Write an enzyme that holds these catalytic residues in place. Structure first.
Site, PDB file in Angstrom:
ATOM      1  CE1 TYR D  49      36.382   0.983 -21.609  1.00 19.87           C
ATOM      2  CE2 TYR D  49      36.549   0.231 -24.742  1.00 19.87           C
ATOM      3  CZ  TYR D  49      35.990   1.024 -23.384  1.00 19.87           C
ATOM      4  OH  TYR D  49      35.279   2.439 -23.655  1.00 19.87           O
ATOM      5  CG  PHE D  57      31.661  -4.531 -17.650  1.00 21.24           C
ATOM      6  CD1 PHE D  57      32.673  -4.083 -17.508  1.00 21.24           C
ATOM      7  CD2 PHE D  57      30.872  -4.957 -15.438  1.00 21.24           C
ATOM      8  CE1 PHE D  57      33.102  -3.378 -16.368  1.00 21.24           C
ATOM      9  CE2 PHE D  57      31.876  -4.153 -14.575  1.00 21.24           C
ATOM     10  CZ  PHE D  57      32.921  -3.214 -15.519  1.00 21.24           C
ATOM     11  CB  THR D  91      29.394   6.023 -14.123  1.00 21.78           C
ATOM     12  OG1 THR D  91      31.163   6.767 -13.941  1.00 21.78           O
ATOM     13  CG2 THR D  91      29.693   4.390 -14.887  1.00 21.78           C
ATOM     14  NE  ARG D 102      28.654   9.206 -17.474  1.00 23.45           N
ATOM     15  CZ  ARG D 102      29.521   9.351 -17.501  1.00 23.45           C
ATOM     16  NH1 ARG D 102      30.349   8.604 -18.248  1.00 23.45           N
ATOM     17  NH2 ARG D 102      30.926   9.207 -16.364  1.00 23.45           N
ATOM     18  CG  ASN D 112      28.557   5.202 -20.260  1.00 21.99           C
ATOM     19  OD1 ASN D 112      29.009   5.257 -21.118  1.00 21.99           O
ATOM     20  ND2 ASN D 112      28.948   5.281 -18.889  1.00 21.99           N
ATOM     21  CD  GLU D 126      42.011   7.455 -20.477  1.00 25.15           C
ATOM     22  OE1 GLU D 126      41.617   8.289 -20.478  1.00 25.15           O
ATOM     23  OE2 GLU D 126      41.423   5.986 -19.661  1.00 25.15           O
TER      24      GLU D 126
END
Lengths: 149, 149, 149, 149, 149, 149
Positions: D49, D57, D91, D102, D112, D126
């Site tokens: 992240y 957040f 999202t 979703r 989600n 990633e």
């Protein structure tokens, strides 16, 4: 904790879509808090359609909704009112996108399978109308994975 | 025109299996004639399991059925009492067949998802108990394709 | 708490059945404790099928399993070893019943889609062999609805 | 031959959506090239992240992703990065369209269900983080019917 | 390369089971080699049910098969005749196992959804009668993952 | 009573999507009026694509459509031409929305699984060309539940 009124119409019952419809709402993460299969009579029908009493198609609406059993439900969850309409699709089934209930199953405006409350105030009204007896409350063990905090 | 009582147990509701279970009976060609989500109270639970009152596990049965809401249903059709139970599957997980409701979803006899009437006689009794209010009758337009004559 | 080793063979991967197979175990209420997509080398294949090295179709089992990637899994639950085999169905997909994985998807013994441990002692051996790195532990929030007490 | 990183978050695992999610990518015609179920470590999550590190957040994301196991995957195919995002949906599940993962399954932006790389450059990053060991290798027999040329 | 005749009866068509039925044969790994939606004429029906001409239910069979269109099909694969019958399930709905076509969809022996050749001899005869124009040929890219050698 | 021509391309047949595609049309409430599995011959392919005879990609289209069998179909219902195209989804699978046939199954414009008539004019020409023999006639028992009046 917002709640909405979802009704499967007589055509939805006849076309064997009851389970399928409920599953869409279940898999979405919403909580079913009331449910009954019912035959509606005119006087109740007239109250449900009260907003439209002065409309020339009012009588057809009433005539139809009493012509077969319907499934009346209360679903609870975040934005369940507007998200419930999203799941249902557009007013005209033919404008409804594939993946929505009306998109996958319906073609005729007058045979549109299902009803969902159009607003929080409509929902509070519809729920009080259809479920005077209140709800069958419970707490989902999946709550902490469906919702944050 | 034979009818049977079928109940989705608290674990069925919690595991989000309501629609899936209903779809299976609908697709089979059976007719849903009553349906409701309800929180059961002790004395009603005790009446429902009355036949087992002398058994040591009776108390457990009562505690569990009252611990969460259930879905009560009435289904109508040819041989629906036994065929209903065939679709549900064996009580013992080791004996359940893949393709049945318990075969597909249940691993613990105490968390068996669903339950159907043993006989026409016990069904009549269970229907009167769970649905004093009566049924929501209707006639399927698919009748002549589901049944001969 | 019993565990078994489930492996999707190279034909299962090729025919796009990975998700379908996983969904079957998930829906049953079993807990996925390990999962990986792996290309297998012959010496490892021989270790996997060690308890069959004396047989003539040992080479056959070995060649099959190295012919493309497999999906290796550990599943946890009550009677998961025997139940895993029941869900998979008979070795000869000809004898496999509709509703089982082989019954639904397979026609040839040499392309029978999936492998499940044949016994608790085999499962322990297989799990040790494929997953020496250990399992991914977690507790399902649905545990009290899948199992009694 | 383009590849992207897809991750089923802890709520997807808990809500039993693993097989369903894999099936959607398989049926689309994409090729699974890596797969593991893993418990994520805190400093590892802080790296994953990193781009959001100076956001408010951020710590919540890190706390949440290590709170249960996840399913880490690499999928390969033409435009798999953007198309994976399209399959996943908006999202904010409030906006996600029915028919998307979703859209069908999620109601809370903080729960989600799944993550997909946002660009080819994020995908490469990633994939290097989650699968330093590289990919499994295979060629689909359906290639000439999924792709032209 | 063994072949069998599979026919969806008028009730299968009326109840919207065409795609579902074809899917079950496709997923099993069998090859559709012939396919047509057809209205059946009385004298053709008399020929199809010729072997039952002396039976008292003969005329009822003839009337029924011509009361709607049928979907006539030829499927090819190993043991497709007996396996076709297994997929279809028992003639009598009190016997049909959940997971089979009749098990899942039929309740009346006179409305049993589908027909499958009962033997290789019967298959050959039915195929010659229903498809004198022959079959459409093709080779499946999945052959080597469905069959060994 | 509007009708449209829908064709499952060779790739749709190879990928085992025939039943899945038919199911989507049946569930929507449309009526199947013609259906057959066909090996297309060059001169017929040239007629079907006659409108594109001057296009540089014309010969490519012809080559492809005769490389494997296709499933030709006619469907009938309100606005079935445009609705057919809506169910099928955008021509380019980069744009096709999840929930549509191409959205769920296709990734390459050259392997886009299915074709539907783009207009009433085209549908009439296509139906005349592929089904000179005419359509099956039947009336669905569901008609009064799919359509008002």
């Amino acid at each position: 904790m917002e709640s909405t009124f979802i009704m499967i119409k007589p055509d939805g019952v006849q076309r064997g879509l009851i389970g399928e419809i409920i599953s869409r709402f279940e898999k979405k993460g919403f909580y079913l808090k009331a449910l009954k299969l019912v035959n509606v009579e005119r006087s109740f029908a007239e109250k449900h359609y009260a907003d439209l009493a002065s409309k020339p198609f009012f009588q057809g609406l009433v005539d139809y909704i009493i012509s077969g059993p319907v499934v009346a439900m209360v679903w609870e969850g975040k934005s369940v009112v507007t998200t419930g309409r999203k799941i249902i699709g557009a007013t005209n089934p033919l404008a409804s996108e594939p993946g929505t209930i009306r998109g996958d199953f319906a073609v005729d405006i007058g045979r549109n399978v299902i009803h969902g409350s159009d607003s929080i105030e409509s929902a509070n009204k519809e729920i009080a109308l259809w479920f005077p007896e209140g709800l069958a409350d419970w707490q989902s063990s999946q709550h902490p994975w469906i919702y944050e905090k």
